[PDB]
Write a protein that binds this ligand. Structure first.
Ligand SMILES: [Zn+2]
Ligand SMILES: [Zn+2]
Ligand SMILES: [Zn+2]
Ligand SMILES: [Zn+2]
Ligand SMILES: [Zn+2]
Ligand SMILES: [Zn+2]
Lengths: 107, 440, 108, 106, 440, 106
């Protein structure tokens, strides 16, 4: 398992469950796991797939995911809904890159 | 038996004219002309034609042949509202050999009264046959009877309310019509033993009708005690079980014991000699009756009947005889804009009719069903249906929702409406009374 | 002596003066009338087959002690057109001739 | 025992009650019909208590005439101008019986 | 049980006040005052009293004891129109030893709510108990929500017809009331699966109601194709087959899966953010339901109900909950000269009543047999008789002969009238709408 | 394993990520699997937790899961958004009861 320092600076939602990095490379969130009301983590995966027609915020609709992600110091990310997230890790195995982000409690 | 065939053969050989033999039964004694076809009619068959010209089965189709008023095995017309009948023998003898087979084969068949063509072999139809048939019911046995009295009109100032006596009342149609016309009523004494009708009248007319129960118990003392009367009216539906059975009568029985009580009570109620106050009466019976009974009734009442049919101002076939002395009741029957002369104007919203006039109805709902196949007379969502009570009420001229009381099953309403009189006919007869009695 | 008759007539309608026709149009005639007292009167009816004439209206029959129309009320009593009541005393057949008797009843 | 005492004038005091000029009552007992037309009536003399008089209206319709009067040739003229023939007038056991018959019109 | 007796004995000995114990079950955790008698009441008894204070059995008499809303054996009040209950234990403890037996002896007996006296041992009646009982039904559980938005009056010039959507329609009472008020209607889409009510509406309203069948088949695409709506009204009767059997209703079940469909369709039809057109809704249910269901319904709709009883403006006992946001539906319920507030004004001619209000009529046939011994509520010719349909129609405020259509058996008419809403209540609720939509 | 033969009739949203069936038992969504835009799977497990306060739908806020499920006939759960869901498996594991729902295309 390779420990990877590749770190997406900004992720934009081109379609529901589809996010584009500043390099236009697609990231697909696969699963959401809930241990506590303030503990919600989502797994993101890098992929090279055909992008569809763009979807407006209205078309995206309500979703537990935020619409915007932006890099924050100390290995953190600032979401559209003002929440902060932590980078649990980012590894590459068998040519597959997996990144896991977790929600931080508010204060 | 060979006489009729021999006469037909001779006429087809051009030896005799068809206006000099009795086509119905084949006799050389000719005294009358057939009202429908071209030919002669003998004395014996005149009575049978009078009897059976207006008798229909439970299914609405005719009972007896058209020409000979008899028959053993029959055809039948197809056009609705023309449910007449013809028997095999007449078709073969008169129209031609084998024509009955062709008539049976064709579907639907139009009898000789529908077809635009006026001749079929020997059978030839007349041009004014409706008027001829109407006038044929003016061959009463005796005529010596003098015209009735004409009481001079009373000036409006001296007019006073009316006092009525009704026998076999029904559901009080007379009081309804009298209220409609606008004539004040002081009394209305009714005799009746039907519970449903009593309740309907009691609820509807705010307890204005006095009931005295059975008719076989009224005495002359009661008549003298209940005050002078000014109008005595009786007739069907004969609610009191004075006539034993609806069907066991045949054609003869029941009428005598129905008329006996009316004659007795009228005799009791009539003004005595020397009194000149106005007095009127009325009696009603069906067309299908024996000749002797009609002769006797006319003798004893000393008048001849006036046949009135309700199909001229309503949507039903109902013909009756009316004995009476009301002023000018022989005048022609005319309609007004307030009538509903078609069955399409009596149905509710969203329903389609199949005839122009409703054929017949009896006690049971199966009577309303039409045809040997028992098809219903109304269309609804492309599915046949029977008439509702709210449609029969319009058909008979009553106000709508007249018979909704006392939680009667919806089968008793049909009987109540079927047995009753027709309002537009009774209004015709009562109209002249306004000249003698006060008005609201 | 005379053989009793069970099939009573149902009506007696005046055809002529002193001739009465029952429901089957058979002719009966009143042959004798007995007068016991002012309120007791009896009439004897016998059936004879005779050739009948032209019928008469009540106004031409004229006044008469007998009524114009009898009728068999239930329970075997005959009411007349004047609302009175009559009682059947006997109804017998002798040597082929049938006789009937009717007796008036007091007023109550 | 034939009696030649023919009453002169008989008046109806009450129905089925007739008074002779001697005020003696006569009661008609039976009326007999021959064939269909001829009418015969039997009168009997008696002494009974007379009731309240009855007017012609109270008497009502009746086959009997209301008045009888003697006529020559042993005949009587009724109220309606018809003629009646005496058949016999006899006395038996102190009771007098008279029979009158209607003559045909001409 | 012994605990309640012990505290009762102590209050008798004047050691405790009766306002410091829960008289219903004996617990010392007092939180409220009893609405009817003088004393305290605890939380569990409060919930049970909310649940069971309006439940009546088949004969029309109360189901559970007045005090403890439970009980094993109960007496019965005698005065008609006061069919209440008292169980033996309560009468024996709170009134005195042996009192219930004495009441059993007497015949007839007036319970403690009729009696002119206000005290019987410890059981004392409050003088303002009617108002207190009315107010006891405003202890809404849990939250108090925000006020609803008031939509500004539309000027008379711009008003336009109304478009309606109805669920579980019945016999179309809403359209009848809207016609009565004088408001123009552009659409009225109805969902229904009962044939009789479909026929009644089709005949009566001249085919203005569009039927779309059952409710479990309607999709979101239909709610868009059928155009924008401006009034979504739902509730009972449960004509569809989503309940079918009350055997699985109990008190909590059966009534939980109609709100599902109503909420789904309402969510679909609601205007989206940014469209500020007027929008209204209304939901209805019985008073006797579970507390949890009421809490959940109020949460999801985000409002509290307003209890309205028709006995104030009619002649029947019918109490319901009404969720909605119509303008000013909490204002006091007043009457008008057009109402008929007594049962003597609803009978036909010649009949005499026995009560002042119809105790309880429901779909069940025996519900008309009111009172103990299953009385028939009408006297006629000194005999007992049941109400006719033409009298129930007046009782419920409908026009006379409204449900006389399509040869229905009178039992079907009775059920139809029993299931329906009350016209005057709905008119009260809808009255304010005239300020927002055009008028005829 | 151990299959469970009966299913809850309802799932009402009490709090964010808490659901109460018709018998007031709390089920929590532990994991959600996201195959594609039109395919979603939710794993519900039954836990006996101390319930806090109930919330209005406005305070629950936007969420992928619906606010209310209902057991339509044929074993399909219809959500308040009018979509449809399918029951995959229903098992018991040493007292732990689990349920799975999979979305269906429109
Ligand atoms: Zn002939
Ligand atoms: Zn023939
Ligand atoms: Zn024809
Ligand atoms: Zn308690
Ligand atoms: Zn109790
Ligand atoms: Zn009471």
């Amino acid at each position: 398992g390779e420990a990877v320092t590749d770190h997406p600076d900004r992720l934009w939602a081109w379609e529901k469950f589809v996010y584009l990095d500043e390099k236009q490379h697609a990231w697909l969130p696969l699963t959401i796991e809930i241990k506590d009301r303030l503990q919600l983590r989502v797994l993101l995966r890098r992929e090279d797939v055909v992008l569809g027609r763009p979807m407006t915020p209205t078309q995206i609709g309500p979703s537990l995911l935020p619409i915007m992600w932006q890099l924050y110091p100390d290995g953190r990310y600032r979401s559209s809904d003002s929440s902060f997230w932590r980078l649990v890790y980012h590894i590459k195995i068998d040519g597959v890159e997996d990144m896991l982000l977790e929600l931080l409690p508010d204060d | 038996e060979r006489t009729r065939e021999r006469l037909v053969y001779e006429v087809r050989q051009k030896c005799r004219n068809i206006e000099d033999i009795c086509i119905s039964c084949g006799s050389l004694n000719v005294t009358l002309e057939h009202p429908l076809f071209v030919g002669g009619m003998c004395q014996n068959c005149k009575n049978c034609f009078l009897e059976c010209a207006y008798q229909y089965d439970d299914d609405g189709y005719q009972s007896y042949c058209t020409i000979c008023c008899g028959g053993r095995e029959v055809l039948m017309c197809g056009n609705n509202n023309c449910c007449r009948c013809f028997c095999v023998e007449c078709v073969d003898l008169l129209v031609g050999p084998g024509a009955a087979q062709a008539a049976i084969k064709e579907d639907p068949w139009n009898c000789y009264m529908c077809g635009h063509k006026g001749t079929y072999g020997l059978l030839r139809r007349r041009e004014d046959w409706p008027s001829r048939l109407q006038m044929f019911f003016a061959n009463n046995h005796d005529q010596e009877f003098d015209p009735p009295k004409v009481y001079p009109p009373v000036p409006a100032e001296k007019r006073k309310p009316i006092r009525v006596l009704s026998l076999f009342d029904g559901i009080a149609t007379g009081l309804l019509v009298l209220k409609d016309l606008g004539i004040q009523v002081d009394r209305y004494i009714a005799s009746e033993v039907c519970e449903d009708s009593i309740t309907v009248g009691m609820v509807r007319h705010q307890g204005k009708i006095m009931y005295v129960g059975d008719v076989r118990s009224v005495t002359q003392k009661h008549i003298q005690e209940w005050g002078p009367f000014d109008l005595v009216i009786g007739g069907s539906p004969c609610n009191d079980l004075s006539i034993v059975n609806p069907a066991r009568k045949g054609l003869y029985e029941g009428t005598g014991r129905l008329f006996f009580e009316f004659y007795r009570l009228l005799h009791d109620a009539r003004p005595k000699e020397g009194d000149d106050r106005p007095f009127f009466w009325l009696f009603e019976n069906v067309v299908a009756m024996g000749v002797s009974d009609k002769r006797d009734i006319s003798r004893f009442l000393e008048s001849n009947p006036v046949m009135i049919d309700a199909k001229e101002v309503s949507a039903a076939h109902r013909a009756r005889y009316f004995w009476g002395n009301l002023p000018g009741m022989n005048r022609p029957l005319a309609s007004t804009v307030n009538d509903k002369l078609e069955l399409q104007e009596c149905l509710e919203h969203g329903r389609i009719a199949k005839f122009s006039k409703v054929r017949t109805i009896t006690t049971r709902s199966n009577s309303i069903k039409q045809g040997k196949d028992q098809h219903f007379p109304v269309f609804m969502n492309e599915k046949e249906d029977i008439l509702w009570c709210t449609e029969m009420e319009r058909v008979f001229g009553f106000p709508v929702h007249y018979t909704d009381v006392s939680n009667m099953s919806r089968l008793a309403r049909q009987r109540l409406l079927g047995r009753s009189w027709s309002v537009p006919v009774i209004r015709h007869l009562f109209a002249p009374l306004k000249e003698y009695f006060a008005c609201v």
